[PDB]
């Protein structure tokens, strides 16, 4: 369970997220690619592309980035108490997607590495060790969703 003070620690950094929601959702695709290629491989819609400048340059890519960032914005700003959030986004997860938990850990740590190059300002150490904090929280709520919906993720 998070402090308010780790949840404003979280909230300050996500602030300068959305400034540019869009450009931030693009880094933070582009560095779970290159870091773990196979998850592209779960995007029927653009797993063909090869190279960093296609997925700048991809439009699909921009629209999934906003997607997943403004879904987290929205499960982070409930600061713990996300479990409408979670139900059917657990689902389609689970089922249709089939992300394993693995690879919401490599999406995470994709999210730690942008904000850390980003936002010195906001992204210090204790910010860090906050957001870690919170997306654990996410990580371990989803995890035990899946197991409700017979998925071993
Ligand atoms: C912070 C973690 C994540 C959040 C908040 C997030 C959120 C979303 C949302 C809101 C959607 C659209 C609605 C839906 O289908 O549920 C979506 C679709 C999708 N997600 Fe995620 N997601 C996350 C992580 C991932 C990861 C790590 C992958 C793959 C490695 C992934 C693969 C997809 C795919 C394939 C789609 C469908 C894209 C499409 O048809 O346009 N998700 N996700």
């Known amino acids: 369970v998070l402090s308010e003070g780790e949840w404003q620690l979280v909230l300050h950094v996500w602030a ?36 960093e400048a296609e997925m700048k340059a991809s439009e699909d890519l921009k629209k999934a980035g906003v997607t997943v960032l403004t879904a987290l ?38 999210i730690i590495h942008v904000l850390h190059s980003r936002h010195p300002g906001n992204f210090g150490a204790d910010a860090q060790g906050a957001m870690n904090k919170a997306l654990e929280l996410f990580r371990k709520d989803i995890a035990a969703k899946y197991k409700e919906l017979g998925y071993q993720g």
């Open 73 to 110: 914005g929205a499960i982070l700003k409930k600061k713990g108490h996300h479990e409408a959030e979670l139900k059917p986004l657990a689902q389609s997860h689970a089922t249709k997607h089939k992300i394993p938990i693995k690879y919401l850990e490599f999406i995470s740590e994709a």
């Open 16 to 51: 300068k997220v959305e400034a540019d929601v869009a450009g931030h959702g693009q880094d933070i695709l582009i560095r779970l690619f290159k870091s773990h290629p196979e998850t592209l491989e779960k995007f029927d819609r653009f797993k063909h592309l090869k190279t």
